[PDB]
Design a protein around this ligand. Structure first.
Ligand SMILES: *Cc1ccc(S(=O)(=O)N(C)CCS*)cc1
Ligand SMILES: *Cc1ccc(S(=O)(=O)N(C)CCS*)cc1
Ligand SMILES: [Cl-]
Ligand SMILES: [Cl-]
Ligand SMILES: [Mg+2]
Ligand SMILES: [Mg+2]
Ligand SMILES: [Mg+2]
Ligand SMILES: [Mg+2]
Ligand SMILES: [Mg+2]
Ligand SMILES: [Mg+2]
Lengths: 8, 236, 236, 8
C-alpha cells in the first residue's frame, strides 16, 4: 500500500 | 512558443479534449500556452493546469522508481556487472522529470503566484510550488538537496499559513495541501511524527466543520479526509 | 539519427528497461535505433520492436477514437457550433499516428522484410506491415483509402500464404496473423462473413493440432485461440 | 465488448 498524495 | 498563435479559449478547449483522450502531455502543453497568454486563471483553468502536469510527472515518477529499483539491485553484492545502461537510462528519465518540474515552477514564478491575490488561487499555486519542489527532492542526491527540500517546505508553509487564516478546515484545497505537506514531512523531511500530527489535526478539524456543508460539499471534503485516514492507517 | 552513437546491445538493453518502466515511446525509439544498425533481428528482438510500436500506436488509436466520436457528435443536428478546435485536435493526433505508422512501415521496407528468409521472421514482418496499413486504413477518408486497404490486404495475404505452407496451425505467429486478418476483413474490408470463416477455420485447425504440443506450447496456442473464440462469440 | 486483435 503506497501512501496517498492529492490525486484523483 | 509553439502555442503563441492559438487563441487562449482554443487552448483551454483543446486541453479539455486532451483530458478526455488521456493525452496529458498535449493537455499540459495547451495549458502552458494558456498560462503564457498572461491573464490570470479561473478555478477551472487552474484545475486543468494541475491535472495536466500532475499526470505527466506522475508517469515520469513511476518510471523513475522502477528504474531506480533496478539500479539499486544492480549495486548489491553478487550482482553481475551490466555496464552503464541502467544508470544512463535512469538519468535520462530523471532529467526529463526535472525538466517538467522546472517548467511548472517557471510558470508559477512568471507570473502566476505574484498575480494571485485571492486565497483560493494563491494557496493552490503555493501548494503546486511545494509539490514540484517535492518531486525534485525525490530524485535529488547532491549538494542542493537541502535547498530543494527547504524550497518545498517554504512554499507549503506559506500555503498553510494563508489557508488557516482564510479558508474553512473543510476546504478541498486546504485539505489536499495538508495531505501533501504531511507526505512531505513523512518521506522527504524524515519527520514521521510531524506528518502524523498534521494528518490527524487536519482530519479532526475537518470533521468538526462538516455540519456546515451541503451534501455535495460534504462529499468533496470527506473524499480527501479518507486519504488522510488512509495515510494514518498506513503510518500507525 | 539520435541513436546512431549507442551500441546495438545497449539499445536492446534499454528497450527492455523501458518496457519494464512502461515507457513505450522510449522503447520504440531504442528499437528503431537497433533496427537501423542494419543487422537482422532475433525472435526476442522482433518481439521488442512489435511490443514497443503496438503500445505507442495503440494509445494514439484510442485517443483518435475518443476525438473522432466527439467530432461526430458535433456534426449531428442540433449540436452547437464550437469552432474548428475538435477537428484540428483530431487532425493533430491523426497526423502523429500516421507518422508512427509510416515510421514502422519504413523500417519494414528498409530493410527488415527483404532480409527475412525464415518463415518465422518473414511472416512476422508481413503481419506487421498488414497491421500498420490497417491502422492507416482506420483513419483514411480520402482518395488513397482503397490503396491503403489493398496494401494491408496484400501484406496479410502473403503472410498467410507463407504461414500455411511453412508453420503448424498452432504456431502463435500464424494464429495472431489470422486473428488480425480476420479483424481486417470484419471492420476494414466490409467482409464479416470472410472474417467469421477465417476465425472458425483457424480455430478448428489449431484445435486438431494441440495434441502435438508440450504443456507450455499448448498454453501459448490456446491463449490466442481464445481471442478467436471471443471474436466469434461477438460476431455471431 | 470491443473485438480482439493480437494484443497482450
Ligand atoms: C490542491 C487540490 C487539488 C485537487 C483536489 S480534488 O480534486 O478535490 N481531489 C479530491 C484530489 C485529492 S486531494 C483538492 C486539492
Ligand atoms: C504476431 C504475434 C505477436 C504476438 C503474439 S503473442 O505474444 O503470442 N500474444 C498472445 C499476442 C496475442 S496474438 C502472437 C503473434
Ligand atoms: Cl539513455
Ligand atoms: Cl491542435
Ligand atoms: Mg486573443
Ligand atoms: Mg474565506
Ligand atoms: Mg511517537
Ligand atoms: Mg557496435
Ligand atoms: Mg516449419
Ligand atoms: Mg451468412
Amino acid at each position: 500500500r503506497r501512501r496517498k498524495s492529492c490525486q484523483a | 512558443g509553439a502555442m503563441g498563435s492559438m487563441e487562449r479559449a482554443s487552448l483551454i478547449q483543446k486541453a479539455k479534449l486532451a483530458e478526455q483522450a488521456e493525452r496529458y502531455e498535449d493537455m499540459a502543453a495547451f495549458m502552458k500556452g494558456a498560462v503564457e497568454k498572461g491573464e490570470e486563471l479561473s478555478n477551472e483553468e487552474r484545475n486543468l493546469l494541475s491535472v495536466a502536469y500532475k499526470n505527466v510527472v506522475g508517469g515520469q515518477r513511476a518510471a523513475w522508481r522502477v528504474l531506480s529499483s533496478i539500479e539499486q539491485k544492480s549495486n548489491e553484492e553478487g550482482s553481475e556487472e551490466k555496464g552503464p545502461e541502467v544508470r544512463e537510462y535512469r538519468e535520462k528519465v530523471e532529467t526529463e522529470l526535472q525538466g517538467v518540474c522546472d517548467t511548472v515552477l517557471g510558470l508559477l514564478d512568471s507570473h502566476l503566484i505574484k498575480e494571485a491575490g485571492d486565497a483560493e488561487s494563491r494557496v493552490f499555486y503555493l501548494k503546486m510550488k511545494g509539490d514540484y519542489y517535492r518531486y525534485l527532492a525525490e530524485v535529488a542526491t547532491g549538494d542542493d538537496k537541502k535547498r530543494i527540500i527547504d524550497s518545498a517546505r517554504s512554499a507549503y508553509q506559506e500555503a498553510m499559513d494563508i489557508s488557516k487564516k482564510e479558508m474553512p478546515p473543510t476546504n478541498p484545497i486546504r485539505l489536499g495541501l495538508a495531505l501533501n505537506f504531511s507526505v512531505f514531512h513523512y518521506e522527504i523531511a524524515n519527520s514521521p511524527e510531524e506528518a502524523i500530527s498534521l494528518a490527524k489535526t487536519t482530519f479532526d478539524e475537518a470533521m468538526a466543520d462538516l455540519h456546515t456543508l451541503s451534501e455535495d460539499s460534504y462529499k468533496d471534503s470527506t473524499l480527501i479526509m479518507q486519504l488522510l485516514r488512509d495515510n494514518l492507517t498506513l503510518w500507525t
